């Protein structure tokens, strides 16, 4: 109807396939993200499916560059195209200017790739028939506005967020963010906050072979925390549930 | 129920069609104008054995005959040809050759002529013979 | 065609020429022929594809003896009758002549 | 063998039933007592001769009704008032008197050929453990369909409303069609069975009326199991385009929601649905609380395939040749209708011999033919 | 072959015969309905019967002639009749049925209009007992329903002081299975006003124009009544938006859609008809039935919340014999935005885990397993929070 | 049928069939029972026009609003010799 | 076409004439039987030929509604159609699907 | 031409990926088990029909590198296309980066063919799933990867794809452990032989085994070897 | 409409199977029997034409056997028309390999190449695959004689004896019972003909409807000599097997 064409307007007045893209984020293993002014933490659910799975080499944490981290949640066939493009873009900026790329500018570039649906619209080359099916939590630190967290849609639109949760359990996560986000969080209090919201939308036992934490810090760069650190933080959350 | 009276009447046709059989008489003649109205217990032999087809295509000597027997009926002038009108249209039925000639006697009467001219006959021929996807009006298939 | 509900599947071959001769012979005992007309001879002129085709050689032959006005069905009728049905056989083997207008 | 005595015991009691009943009728029936004889005098006073069936259009509450007869004149009838004034409702068939019409009486039941289709005419003699195996997926139809009807006891204990409905689905030949017929044999609750391919007619609007009938009979009969066999045959099947087609398919689906629970609040109906295409069904039907637990069927594994083949070989004659245990081995996660077809075909190979011993050789030849419906009705054969 | 196999066949056939013989001698019958308190009835049986005094040949007025009437009998035969022995002229209207004496046609007894309705006497039904307290979720949402339908029926005193004409219409809409009809069955016990319930795919029949007639007669019967509710259920088939095909038989269905429009507005406005529309979908409905002048205030009863699901489950587990130590707040956490029919099946599937163990009670644990089962099936299917997309 | 008879008893009668569009339909009968009323009634016209009645003083005029609503035995000339379009 | 006679004699004629064999052997008696090949090879005439010897009523069905004039749809004429065959047992329902009706 | 042969779904899916996985399902069965000093890919071989010359018949395991192997399930036509393309990738890592390919590189490359056909039109993804395994140069760590026709990849300790993969998967739950993979070449090989003898059965004629040993050792185990493991395991 | 008239025939079906590939196998059952039998001293290819008429010239007809190179010939079962394009692509490819390596192309490579072209039609362009099945007789010194069938999907299966086209199942049962692993070319010539006599497409098998060809290592010095018999040399062998 309106799903046989990759560029057609519908009798609502906006794209139908794009709606289906938003409903492909609800097939992703939850990626949660808390930004504060002490650094930004990204956590992701890996999702174990069997004890035959090797999960400590699988992660939905990705390095775009030294000063920018990313977590992806949704169809990950689509996310491979976008992450490779993010990696080039950052390196191009550093080629052209010998300078760090802003988190906002980097995200905006990835939104330009996300708008490439159509096969006969405008002048610019179409390398797709449809839209993507994946959203991003590009976190980072630039020296202009400090720490930043952006949420990028497969639409080709982006918002700056202070906290965002995408994936299957996104609505149940987002309810917890409204009541639990505040400006006086710390880096470590933020890190425990990730696991709290992740535990509810976890379908298994929350442990360190199905969750991965990562930070982006000015002075340490982008560091992906090892499963030892994840295991520790998980246990201390249960001690703050032993306070209630 | 009223549509079941129709069916009951058809059933009596079968009964009387079977009963009539192997008798001196000519087993019932019936004609149709659509051969998609039949049933597989009507078209079945023992009721309808013989199937005389009726085409609209025939061939050039048998279409020639239709122009000529209705030409016997009417008067003409010897300027009208009957036989250079066979090739111009092949998808004609005989009632539509009865139409051509009957309309030529209308066109003669707008002149106030009582003999059929080739002006009257070819002006009439052209209309009421419509244009199809089978006819030679469009032809490059040769 | 799900297995468990079908336990026999029976094909019918378009006839042999050995089979096509015996179908001519079943119908020809209704008929009265001139003695010395072989029906093995008729089935070899045919190639057929149904036992109706050979049912129509018998039918057409007795309508030719009807026209002729002899009691006996002649050997001449079975030459012509084979060729009428054969022409009709080969004229639905192209794309199909209509049977209903 | 040697069940002869059980057959004769059963038989003997049948002979005793025939006897006592015949002799009882003959001058000890109800011929010589005044509570029959004097009651029927005044029963026949107001009864015919003709008893002229009517159709009950509407009641009026003064002891009258407006009937329309099959013979086409209306009557504003009275009601004698011994047949219980309000025990008769629209759609009942009424006995009117040969003179001035009073409702003489009321007939309960008038056999239509349209409830014949639903109602059974045969008994499904294969019941529990002739569909043996899937003993973990029979606790979701005999702990929520058979068992609440047999024991409301267990469900008084928890309180709340008892289970309602089930949907069966899985691969063909997992016994799905027979399971339903096997729990309704044992409970002896009112078994309606309707095929999925009769809901779709080449006539419109009378399709949903047929489906509406089926549940009214169920609610009228307190213990009720309705087997809708095949409701994948509503989205793959259509006739003409003016009375089948999409419009018909939408209407029937919606009728069924009102019937099954909707707003009706009718008698307890268990619904059993066979399907294997589970998106021909409403998003208001495959939510639970109408159909509670959902049942998945997989092809039975090897030790379950021993049980399936053991039903079939009690009927088979056996030999020192026969090796059952290798017939299971070749089959790998295969259906119980393949095993059922192998033994039926193995008996066809015996019959051809004209022998009454069924051997291992007859089973294995039939096994290769049964796997031939899976490798040559596939024209690629070996996966290209 | 054993020496008995020969003889099982004969005993088996003896059983076949004697079942027949037993039926044949016992006899088969149908009995008449009766009454034990009745053993005398003919004292006034003959007063109702026995000569002409009379059960009446039913007719209908087709024309009032000012001073006799022209009736059409149900015999089709047209006659002149007049007023008999107990009728005013005031009594006799146009289109009014009359009982006239079979032997000579004269008006005996006036009768209500039109014996064509007889299949609308299967759609009038008696209200269920469902307390108001049981609700499809605790919200203000059922309170809005209580301002539009309920309160102006009990007290027109306040709606006259406002001087407004009460809103009669409402839409009940939102995702399937929230108890949209559950909150209206609660209201049906409550108002103590007659409910007439309608099926939208029972208004379709092979010959069209038959279904125009059916719809019309039902609605005017509610106009005869005062304080009634016509609950139009399942008008997602007949009541969705009209559209012309050009080859399809969609036009014959669009006929009853048009009849549903022209009865609601009438040529006279509604005579105390509160109207409910039960729609699974708001997404496709006719703008000629969705116009805000006959559906006026429309209250969406949407998915239960984290609190609203706990509320429903507190009723479901109240009716369940349970043992203390349960958390209903927990269950709401575990379930996403999902039907209260899901939560209605937590308890029953928890009652099945109780029975395997052999209990007379349920606990917290068996609610965990029950919830896990229903959630996996939701993924396995579609409609998990779905509206059936759009707005 | 009985208006044709009346019209043949009558001297020089003009017979107008007026806005025939549903009383001249084709075979259908995947419709309702109504389309068999169309079909019964149509067959009557064909026998009258042509059989042992052929009209020479009683005249047929047929008015239609689109001439492919009509079955082709009502578009058959020799029952409809002249088909006049009024634009 | 003598071959076709052998094949059909085993499965139709034998469990009606002698269901005793089929009970012991265990073979769940033959269900549907597909006849196919050209139109004109007497597929009907073979189903007739069995019926005379088996003592069946040969009921030719054609997917028709003309034989129906008291049910008038083929979707309610299965159960009643079946029950007429059981009364007039033994019986053969020759459902020949042509698939050109409509 | 770019007329979508891959197009978005109303469920937020892509049609060709759902169909592709079912095309991988109906194809052959691959089991991958990795030890601490080997990888083993044993796969199902269709040679059921007789008069097939099994020797010249294409293998289910093809070496791409002198210590990186690849086995396949799904369409047998599509897999060979990938195996030509991979060979180019292998020479390109050597060309520009020197050193033979890493397993992880090759896993991203196969997936990158799939990915291409996933987003663009005029193309559809191959119905092919692979088990990629081997060593990286100067590593004696086994690598076991899986690619799927979506363009997604997953690391495994054991994995099985193909027909009745669930039966085999459950069997390896009770034998194989992530914690301590088999510590021997032969024990690994025999565990893969044992799993295949469930579903595939039918001797060493349908069952194949390829073993890679650390740092540039590819060895193939002939039919005779495979048969000897079969009889011992059968007996045990 | 430049997508309103496209039907999509390069897509999989819900089974994972291409519509057009499945249909192609049917249309190849129309064409007559074609047989390959691998003896040890050669390969016999024997095909019966799918058309015959008596005014048809069958003494120069090539409609089954075609030489791709001096050691590799094919039998055709399917459309002549469809096969022709592949036959000339084959000639180019075989000679290309000879041109660059100065060595004749092994049988493996050529078979794989034509298969790729068939898969290529379903992979892209919206093109239908050529419905051809070839039975390849080929020699190389590395595996000796090699026998192959390829199918219109583009896949190849090694064989010892194999048949495609009409009466494929019947032909195969005859080969299975009669084959020795120690057969000569002589034995295989007689087996090929007798198998074609039971899978014959008239009622008599005739020399003028047979193409018959062998590749023999009897030819001196270790060379392989392909000989495509004349119908009048096929007649000689038809009297050997006593059909005539
Ligand atoms: N567990 C079993 N034990 C015995 N017989 C079985 C079993 N499962 C299936 N069968 C047999 O398989 C055949 C088909 O199964 P059934 O008709 O009961 O339902 P289904 O799964 O819907 O399959 P279908 O309708 O395609 O035949 C029947 O003859 C039945 O008796
Ligand atoms: N919130 C709830 N509380 C208790 N039971 C409920 C609730 N919601 C639904 N149910 C159960 O579902 C049954 C049928 O649901 P109902 O007919 O009330 O549906 P609806 O909301 O109108 O949706 P649909 O669009 O599916 O018609 C109810 O009778 C009741 O058993
Ligand atoms: N096997 C046969 N033996 C003898 N005559 C046959 C045979 N099959 C068909 N015929 C002849 O052909 C005619 C047409 O066959 P028919 O019975 O209509 O075939 P079908 O039953 O397949 O529709 C028959 O009436 C009969 O005369
Ligand atoms: Mg079944
Ligand atoms: Mg509803
Ligand atoms: Mg037939």
Cα–Cα dist I137/I68, whole Å: 10
Cα–Cα dist G43/C50, whole Å: 11
- Name the closest residue on chain E to residue A175, using Cα atoms: E306
Query: For every residue of chain E, which 3-state class applies, written as one string?
Result: CCCCHHHHHHHHHHHHHHHHHHHHHHCCCCCCCCCCCCCCCCCCHHHHCCCCCCCEEEEEEEEECCCCEEEEECCCCEEEECECCCCCCCCCCCCCEEEECCCCCCEEEEECCCCCCCCCCCCECCCCCCCCCCCCCCCCHHHHHHHHHHHHHHCCHHHHHHCCCCCCEEEEECCCCCCCCHHHHHHHHHHCCEEEEEECCCCCCCCCCHHHHHHHHHHHHHHHCCCEEEEEECHHHCCCCCCCCCCCCHHHHHHHHHHHHHHHHCCCCCCCEEEEEECCCCCCCCHHHHCCCCCCCCEECCCCCCCHHHHHHHHHCCCECECCCCCCHHHHHHCCCCCCCCCCCHHHHHHHHHHHHCCCCECHHHHHHHHHHHHHHHHHCCCCCCCCCCC
> Is the CB of E389 less than 8 angstroms away from the CB of A12?
no
Task: Give the best residue of I44, I157, I177, I180 to mutate against chain H (max H CB count within 10 A).
Answer: I157
Rounded to a whole number of angstroms, the distance between the first and last alpha carbons of chain H is: 60
- Ligand 6 centre and the CA of G101: distance in Å? 14
Rounded to a whole number of angstroms, the distance between the first and last alpha carbons of chain I is: 61
> Is the CB of G21 less than 8 angstroms away from the CB of D348?
no
Which numbered ligand comes closest to the C-alpha of E232? Answer: 5
Interhelix angle I80-101/I107-123, nearest 10 degrees: 130
Which residues numbered 54-83 in H keep a CB inside 8 Å of some CB on I? 54-58, 74-78, 80-81
> Is the CB of C3 less than 8 angstroms away from the CB of D172?
no
A186 shares contact with chain E (CB less than 8 Å): no
E389 shares contact with chain A (CB less than 8 Å): yes
**Three-state DSSP class for residue H231:** helix
Q: In degrees rounded to 5, what are phi and psi of residue A18?
A: -65, -35
- Ligand 1 centre and the CA of C5: distance in Å? 10
CA distances to E117, E202, E216, E256, E257 from E211, rounded to whole Å, are: 12, 9, 9, 6, 10
Contacts of H135 (CB under 8 A, 6+ apart): H39, H67, H68, H103, H141, H142, H143, H212, H214, H215, H216
Cα–Cα dist I31/E335, whole Å: 62
Q: What is chain D's length? A: 384
The two structure tokens encoding residue E386: 């779905």
The two structure tokens encoding residue E281: 């979908």
C-alpha torsion E105→E111→E117→E119, nearest 10? -100
The two structure tokens encoding residue D70: 């099959």
Among the partner-chain residues B2, B34, B103, the one whose CB lies closest to the CB of F82 is: B103
What is the CATH number that goes with domain I1-244?
A: 3.60.20.10
Report cis status (omega within 30 of 0) of the bond before G90. Answer: yes
Closest to H165 (Cα-Cα) out of H16, H21, H46 = H21
C-alpha torsion D167→D170→D172→D173, nearest 10? -90
**Three-state DSSP class for residue A163:** strand
Cα–Cα dist B98/B67, whole Å: 8
Interhelix angle I107-123/H76-97, nearest 10 degrees: 100
Cα–Cα dist I213/E204, whole Å: 72
Closest to H158 (Cα-Cα) out of A53, G95, A8, C87 = A53
Among the partner-chain residues D332, D381, D383, the one whose CB lies closest to the CB of H199 is: D332
Chains that touch D (3 or more CB pairs under 8 A): C, E, F, G, H, I
Q: Specify burial of residue I103 (Cβ count, 10 A radius: 0-12, 13-18, 19+).
A: exposed
- Ligand 6 centre and the CA of B27: distance in Å? 26
Task: Give the best residue of F22, F31, F32 to mutate against chain E (max E CB count within 10 A).
Answer: F32
**Three-state DSSP class for residue D192:** strand
> Is the CB of E337 less than 8 angstroms away from the CB of A171?
yes
Closest to I61 (Cα-Cα) out of I32, I92, I99, I21 = I32
Q: Count the Cβ atoms, other than its own, within 10 Å of residue A202.
A: 18
D91 shares contact with chain E (CB less than 8 Å): yes
**Three-state DSSP class for residue A129:** coil
Contacts of G18 (CB under 8 A, 6+ apart): none
C-alpha torsion A43→A49→A54→A57, nearest 10? -30
Atom of ligand 2 nearest to the CA of E137: 1
Radius of gyration (C-alpha) of chain H in whole angstroms: 18
**Three-state DSSP class for residue G59:** strand
> Is the CB of C14 less than 8 angstroms away from the CB of G38?
yes
Rounded to a whole number of angstroms, the distance between the first and last alpha carbons of chain A is: 54
Candidate from D126, D175, D195 with most ligand 1 atoms within 8 A of CB, to mutate? D175
**Three-state DSSP class for residue D229:** strand
E191 shares contact with chain D (CB less than 8 Å): no
Provide the CA E158 distance to its chain's centre, in angstroms.
31
Contacts of D17 (CB under 8 A, 6+ apart): E22
Candidate from D125, D340, D373 with most ligand 1 atoms within 8 A of CB, to mutate? D340
* CA–CA min distance G98, chain D (Å): 15
Beta bridge partners of G66: none
E246 is in an annotated binding site: no
Cα–Cα dist A215/G66, whole Å: 80
Is the shortest distance between the CB of E341 and ligand 2 below 6 Å? Answer: yes
Which residues numbered 26-45 in A keep a CB inside 8 Å of some CB on E? none
Boundaries of every domain in chain A = 3-244
Closest to D95 (Cα-Cα) out of D47, D143, D132 = D47
Chains that touch E (3 or more CB pairs under 8 A): A, D, F
Cα–Cα dist C58/C75, whole Å: 12
**Three-state DSSP class for residue A64:** strand
Report which protein residue has its CA nearest ligand 2's atom 29: E182
Beta bridge partners of E57: E100
> Is the CB of C2 less than 8 angstroms away from the CB of D172?
yes
D173 shares contact with chain C (CB less than 8 Å): yes
Whether H5 and I11 have beta carbons less than 8 Å apart is answered as yes
User: What sign has the CA pseudo-torsion E34, E35, E40, E45?
Assistant: negative
> Is the CB of H53 less than 8 angstroms away from the CB of I116?
no
E174 is in an annotated binding site: yes
CA distances to A84, A107, A237, G61 from A33, rounded to whole Å, are: 21, 16, 17, 71
Whether E60 and E98 have beta carbons less than 8 Å apart is answered as yes
Boundaries of every domain in chain I = 1-244
> Is the CB of H7 less than 8 angstroms away from the CB of A76?
no
Q: Which homologous superfamily is A3-244 in?
A: Aminohydrolase, N-terminal nucleophile (Ntn) domain (3.60.20.10)
Atom of ligand 3 nearest to the CA of G37: 22
The two structure tokens encoding residue D295: 């049942």
Closest to H23 (Cα-Cα) out of D332, D171, A49, D384 = D384
Cα–Cα dist E304/E338, whole Å: 7
Contacts of B11 in chain G (CB under 8 A): 66, 69
Cα–Cα dist A151/A103, whole Å: 11
3-state helix, strand, coil in chain G (%, to 5): 40, 15, 45
The 8-class DSSP code of residue D205 comes to: S
H1-236: CATH topology: 3.60.20
Contacts of D311 in chain G (CB under 8 A): none
Method by which this entry was solved: cryo-EM
Token match 């019958």: residue? E29
Boundaries of every domain in chain H = 1-236
Cα–Cα dist C90/C94, whole Å: 7
Atom of ligand 1 nearest to the CA of D174: 21
Q: Specify burial of residue D196 (Cβ count, 10 A radius: 0-12, 13-18, 19+).
A: buried
B7 shares contact with chain F (CB less than 8 Å): no
**Three-state DSSP class for residue G34:** strand
Cα–Cα dist D263/D260, whole Å: 9
**Three-state DSSP class for residue H62:** strand
**Three-state DSSP class for residue A21:** helix
- Name the closest residue on chain D to residue E384, using Cα atoms: D287
D55 is in an annotated binding site: no
Whether D174 and D336 have beta carbons less than 8 Å apart is answered as yes
Provide the CA C72 distance to its chain's centre, in angstroms.
19
Provide the CA E169 distance to its chain's centre, in angstroms.
18
- Ligand 2 centre and the CA of H180: distance in Å? 52
The two structure tokens encoding residue I176: 């299975």
Q: Specify burial of residue E94 (Cβ count, 10 A radius: 0-12, 13-18, 19+).
A: exposed
Cα–Cα dist C39/H11, whole Å: 69
Beta bridge partners of I144: I140
Relative to beta strand D166-170, strand D294-297 is: parallel
| DSSP character string of chain C | --TTSEEEEE--PPP-HHHHHHHHHHHTTTS-BPTT--SHHHHHH---SSTTHHHHHHHHHHHHHHHHT-SSBPTTHHHHHHHHHHHHHHTSSSS---S--
Relative to beta strand E78-81, strand D294-297 is: unpaired
Structural element, H or E, at residue D59: strand D53-60
| DSSP character string of chain I | --SSS----SSB-TTS-BHHHHHHHHHHSSS--EEEEE-SSEEEEEEE-S---SSS--SS--SSEEEEETTEEEEEEE-HHHHHHHHHHHHHHHHHHHHHHSSPPPHHHHHHHHHHHHHHHHHBSSPPPP-EEEEEEEEETTTEEEEEEEETTTEEEE-SEEEESTTHHHHHHHHHHH--TT--HHHHHHHHHHHHHHS-SSSS--GGGEEEEEEES-SGGG--EEEE--HHHHHHHHHHTT--
Is the shortest distance between the CB of E280 and ligand 2 below 6 Å? Answer: yes
Is the shortest distance between the CB of E174 and ligand 2 below 6 Å? Answer: no
Closest to I165 (Cα-Cα) out of I115, I200, I189, I130 = I200
Whether E300 and E152 have beta carbons less than 8 Å apart is answered as no
Cα–Cα dist E150/D139, whole Å: 45
Cα–Cα dist D221/D225, whole Å: 10
Cα–Cα dist A12/A6, whole Å: 16
Interhelix angle H103-119/H76-97, nearest 10 degrees: 120
Resolution value, angstrom units: 6.0
Structural element, H or E, at residue A135: strand A134-142
Buried b (16+ CB within 10 A) or exposed e, H9-30: beebbbbbbbbbbbbbbbbbbb
Cα–Cα dist G34/G27, whole Å: 19
- Ligand 6 centre and the CA of G35: distance in Å? 9
Whether A133 and A78 have beta carbons less than 8 Å apart is answered as yes
């Amino acid at each position: 109807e309106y799903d046989r064409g990759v560029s057609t307007f519908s009798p609502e007045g906006r794209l139908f396939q794009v709606e289906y893209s938003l409903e492909a984020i609800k097939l992703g293993s939850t990626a949660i993200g808390i930004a504060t002014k002490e650094g930004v933490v990204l956590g992701v659910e890996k999702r174990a499916t069997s004890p035959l799975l090797e999960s400590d080499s699988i992660e939905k944490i990705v390095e775009i560059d030294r000063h920018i981290g990313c977590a992806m949640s949704g169809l990950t066939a689509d996310a491979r195209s976008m992450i490779e493009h993010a990696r080039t873009a950052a390196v191009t900026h550093n080629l052209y200017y010998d300078e760090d790329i802003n988190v906002e500018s980097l995200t905006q570039s990835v939104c330009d790739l996300a708008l490439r649906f159509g096969e006969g619209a405008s002048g610019e080359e179409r390398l797709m028939s449809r839209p993507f099916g994946v959203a991003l939590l590009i976190a980072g630190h630039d020296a202009d506005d400090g720490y930043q967290l952006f949420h990028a849609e497969p639409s080709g639109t982006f918002y700056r967020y202070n906290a965002k949760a995408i994936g299957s359990g996104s609505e149940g996560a987002q309810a917890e963010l409204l009541n639990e986000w505040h400006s006086s969080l710390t880096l470590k209090e933020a890190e425990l906050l990730v696991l709290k919201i992740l535990k509810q939308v976890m379908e298994e036992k929350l442990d360190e072979n199905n969750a991965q934490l990562s930070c982006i810090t000015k002075q340490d760069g982008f560091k992906i925390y090892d499963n030892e650190k994840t295991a520790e933080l998980i246990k201390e959350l249960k001690e703050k549930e032993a306070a209630e | 129920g009223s549509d079941r009276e129709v069916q009951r009447i058809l059933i009596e046709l079968l009964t009387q069609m079977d009963g009539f059989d192997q008798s001196t008489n000519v087993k019932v003649i019936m004609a149709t104008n659509r051969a998609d109205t039949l049933d597989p217990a009507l078209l079945r032999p023992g009721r309808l054995d013989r199937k005389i087809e009726f085409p609209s295509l025939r061939d050039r000597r048998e279409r020639r005959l239709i122009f000529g027997t209705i030409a016997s009926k009417m008067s003409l002038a010897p300027e009208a040809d009957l036989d250079s009108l066979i090739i111009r249209n092949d998808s004609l039925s005989g009632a539509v050759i009865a139409a051509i000639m009957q309309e030529a006697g209308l066109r003669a009467v707008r002149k106030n002529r009582y003999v059929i001219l080739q002006s009257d006959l070819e002006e009439a021929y052209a209309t009421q013979v419509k244009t199809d996807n089978t006819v030679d009006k469009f032809d490059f298939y040769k | 065609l799900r297995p468990g509900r079908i336990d026999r599947k029976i094909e019918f071959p378009p006839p042999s020429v050995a089979a096509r001769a015996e179908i001519l012979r079943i119908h020809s005992r209704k008929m009265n022929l001139t003695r010395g007309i072989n029906l093995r001879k008729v089935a070899e002129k045919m190639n057929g594809c149904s036992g109706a085709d050979v049912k129509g050689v018998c039918t057409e032959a007795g309508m030719y003896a009807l026209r002729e006005r002899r009691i006996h069905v002649t050997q001449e009728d079975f030459e012509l009758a084979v060729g009428k049905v054969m022409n009709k056989n080969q004229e639905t083997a192209i794309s199909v002549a209509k049977l209903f207008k | 063998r040697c069940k002869l005595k059980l057959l004769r015991m059963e038989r003997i009691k049948d002979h005793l039933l025939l006897e006592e009943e015949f002799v009882s009728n003959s001058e000890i029936l109800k011929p010589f007592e005044k509570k029959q004889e004097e009651e029927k005098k005044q029963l026949e006073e107001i009864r015919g001769n003709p008893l002229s069936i009517g159709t009950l259009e509407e009641i009026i509450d003064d002891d009258h009704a407006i009937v329309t007869s099959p013979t086409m004149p209306d009557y504003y009838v009275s009601i004698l008032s011994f047949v219980d004034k309000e025990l008769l409702e629209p759609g009942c068939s009424v006995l009117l008197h040969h003179k001035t019409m009073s409702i003489v009486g009321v007939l309960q039941d008038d056999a239509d050929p349209m409830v014949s289709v639903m109602k059974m005419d045969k008994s499904p003699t294969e019941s529990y453990s002739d569909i043996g195996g899937l003993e973990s997926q029979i606790q979701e139809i005999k702990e929520s369909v058979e068992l609440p009807l047999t024991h409301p006891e267990l469900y008084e204990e928890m309180g709340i409303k008892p289970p309602k409905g089930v949907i069966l689905y899985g691969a063909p030949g997992t016994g799905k069609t027979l399971l339903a017929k096997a729990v309704a044999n044992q409970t002896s609750a009112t078994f309606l069975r309707i095929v999925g391919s009769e809901l779709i007619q080449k006539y419109l609007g009378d399709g949903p009326r047929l489906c509406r009938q089926i549940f009214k009979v169920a609610g009228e009969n307190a213990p009720s199991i309705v087997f809708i066999d095949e409701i994948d045959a509503i989205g793959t099947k259509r006739y003409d385009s003016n009375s089948g087609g999409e419009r018909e398919i939408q209407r029937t689906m919606l009728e069924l929601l009102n019937q099954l629970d909707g707003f009706d609040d009718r008698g307890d109906v268990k619904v059993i649905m066979a399907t294997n295409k589970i998106e021909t069904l409403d998003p208001a039907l495959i939510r639970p609380g109408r159909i509670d637990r959902k049942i998945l069927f997989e092809n039975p594994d090897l030790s379950t395939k021993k049980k399936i083949l053991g039903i079939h070989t009690s009927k088979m004659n056996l030999s020192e040749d026969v090796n059952l245990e290798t017939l299971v081995t070749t089959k790998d996660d295969l259906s119980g209708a393949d095993i059922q077809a192998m033994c039926t075909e193995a008996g066809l190979l015996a019959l051809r011999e004209r022998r009454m011993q069924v051997t291992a050789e007859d089973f294995k030849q039939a096994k290769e033919r049964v796997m031939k419906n899976k490798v040559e009705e596939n024209l690629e054969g070996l996966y290209l | 072959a054993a020496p008995y196999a020969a003889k099982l066949k004969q005993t088996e056939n003896d059983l076949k015969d004697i079942e027949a013989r037993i039926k044949e001698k016992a006899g088969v019958k149908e009995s008449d309905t009766g009454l034990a308190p009745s053993h005398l009835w003919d004292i006034m049986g003959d007063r109702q019967r026995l000569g002409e005094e009379h059960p009446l040949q039913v007719a209908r007025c087709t024309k009032i002639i000012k001073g006799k009437y022209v009736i059409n009998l149900k015999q089709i035969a047209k006659f002149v009749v007049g007023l008999g022995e107990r009728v005013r002229p005031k009594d006799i209207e146009e289109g009014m049925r009359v009982g006239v004496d079979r032997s000579k046609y004269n008006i005996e007894l006036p009768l209500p209009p039109r014996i064509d309705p007889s299949v609308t006497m299967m759609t009038v039904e008696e209200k269920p007992d469902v307390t108001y307290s049981d609700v499809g979720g605790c919200k203000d949402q059922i309170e809005k329903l209580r301002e539009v339908v309920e309160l102006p029926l009990l007290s027109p005193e306040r709606f006259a002081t406002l001087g407004i004409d009460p809103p009669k219409g409402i839409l009940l809409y939102g995702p399937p299975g929230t108890g949209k009809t559950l909150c209206a069955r609660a209201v049906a016990n409550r108002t103590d006003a007659t409910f007439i319930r309608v099926i939208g795919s029972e208004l379709v029949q092979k010959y069209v124009g038959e279904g125009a007639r059916m719809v019309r007669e039902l609605f005017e019967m509610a106009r005869t009544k005062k304080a009634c509710i016509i609950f139009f259920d399942e008008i997602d088939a007949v009541g969705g938006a009209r559209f012309d095909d050009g080859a399809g038989g969609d036009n014959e269905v669009q006929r009853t859609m048009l009849e549903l429009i022209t009865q609601l507005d009438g040529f006279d406005p509604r005579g105390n008809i509160k109207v409910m529309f039960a729609t699974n979908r708001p997404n496709t409905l006719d703008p000629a039935l969705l116009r805000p002048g006959r559906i006026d205030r429309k209250v969406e009863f949407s998915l239960p919340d984290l609190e609203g699901r706990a509320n429903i489950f507190r009723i479901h587990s109240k009716s369940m014999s349970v043992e203390r130590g349960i958390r209903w707040e927990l269950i709401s956490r575990l379930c996403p935005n999902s039907t209260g029919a899901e939560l209605r099946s937590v308890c029953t599937e928890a009652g099945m885990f109780a029975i395997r163990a052999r209990r007379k009670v349920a606990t917290e644990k068996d609610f965990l397993k029950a919830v896990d089962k229903v959630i996996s099936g939701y993924k396995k299917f579609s409609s998990t929070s779905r509206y059936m997309q759009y707005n | 049928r009985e208006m044709f008879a009346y019209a043949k008893e009558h001297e020089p009668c003009i017979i107008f069939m007026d806005e025939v569009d549903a009383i001249g339909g084709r075979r259908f009968s995947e419709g309702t029972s109504a389309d068999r009323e169309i079909q019964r009634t149509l067959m009557e016209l064909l026998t009258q026009m042509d059989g042992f009645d052929n009209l020479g003083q009683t005249k047929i005029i047929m008015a239609t609003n689109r001439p492919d609503t009509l079955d082709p035995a009502l578009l058959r000339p020799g029952r409809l010799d002249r088909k006049v379009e009024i634009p | 076409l003598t071959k076709q006679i052998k094949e059909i004699k085993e499965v139709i004629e034998l469990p009606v004439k002698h269901p005793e064999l089929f009970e012991s052997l265990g073979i769940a008696q033959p269900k549907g039987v597909i006849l196919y090949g050209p139109p004109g090879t007497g597929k009907t005439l073979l189903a007739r030929a069995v019926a005379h010897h088996t003592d069946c009523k040969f009921i030719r069905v054609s997917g028709a509604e003309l034989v129906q004039k008291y049910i008038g749809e083929g979707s309610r004429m299965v159960r009643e159609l079946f029950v007429m065959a059981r009364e007039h047992a033994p019986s053969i329902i020759f459902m020949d699907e042509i698939d050109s009706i409509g | 031409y770019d007329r979508a042969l891959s197009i978005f779904s109303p469920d937020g899916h892509i049609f060709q990926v759902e169909y592709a996985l079912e095309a991988v399902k109906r194809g052959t069965c691959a089991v991958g088990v990795k030890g601490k000093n080997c990888v083993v890919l044993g796969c199902e071989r269709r040679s059921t029909l007789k008069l097939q010359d099994t020797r010249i018949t294409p293998s289910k395991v093809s070496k791409i590198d002198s210590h990186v192997v690849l086995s396949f399930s799904g369409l047998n036509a599509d897999s060979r296309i990938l195996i030509e393309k991979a060979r180019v990738e292998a020479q390109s890592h050597r060309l520009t980066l020197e050193d033979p390919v890493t397993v992880e590189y090759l896993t991203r490359y196969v997936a990158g063919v799939q990915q291409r056909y996933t987003q663009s039109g005029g193309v559809r993804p191959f119905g092919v799933s692979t088990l990629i395994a081997g060593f990286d140069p100067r590593d004696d760590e086994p690598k076991l990867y899986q690619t799927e026709p979506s363009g997604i990849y997953s690391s495994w300790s054991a994995q099985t794809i193909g027909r009745n993969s669930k039966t085999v998967r459950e069997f390896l739950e009770k034998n194989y452990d992530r914690k301590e993979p088999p510590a021997t070449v032969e024990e690994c090989v025999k565990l893969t032989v044992r799993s295949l003898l469930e579903v595939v059965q039918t001797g060493a004629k349908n069952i194949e085994i390829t073993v890679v040993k650390p740092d540039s050792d590819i060895v193939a185990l002939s039919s005779e070897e495979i048969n000897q493991y079969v009889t011992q395991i059968e007996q045990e | 409409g430049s997508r309103r008239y496209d039907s999509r025939t390069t897509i999989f079906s819900p089974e994972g199977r291409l519509y057009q590939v499945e249909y192609a196998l049917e249309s190849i059952s129309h064409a007559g029997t074609a047989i390959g039998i691998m003896a040890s001293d050669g390969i016999v290819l024997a095909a019966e034409r799918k058309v015959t008429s008596t005014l048809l010239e069958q003494d120069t007809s090539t409609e089954k056997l075609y030489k791709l190179n001096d050691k590799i010939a094919v039998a055709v079962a399917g459309l002549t028309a469809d096969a022709e394009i592949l036959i000339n692509t084959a000639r180019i490819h075989a000679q290309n390999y000879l041109k660059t390596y100065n060595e004749d192309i092994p049988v493996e490579i050529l078979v794989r190449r034509l298969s790729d072209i068939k898969q290529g039609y379903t992979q892209h362009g919206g093109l239908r695959p050529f419905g051809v099945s070839f039975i390849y007789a080929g020699y190389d010194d590395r595996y000796g004689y090699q026998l192959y069938t390829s199918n219109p999907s583009g896949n190849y299966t090694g064989w010892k004896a194999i048949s495609v086209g009409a009466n494929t199942s019947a032909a195969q049962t005859l080969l299975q019972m009669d084959y020795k692993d120690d057969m000569k070319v002589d034995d295989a010539i007689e087996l090929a003909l007798k198998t074609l006599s039971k899978t014959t497409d008239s009622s008599a098998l005739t020399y003028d409807r047979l193409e018959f060809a062998t590749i023999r290592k009897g030819a001196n010095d270790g060379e392989v000599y392909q000989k495509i018999f004349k119908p009048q040399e096929i007649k000689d062998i038809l009297v050997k097997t006593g059909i005539t």
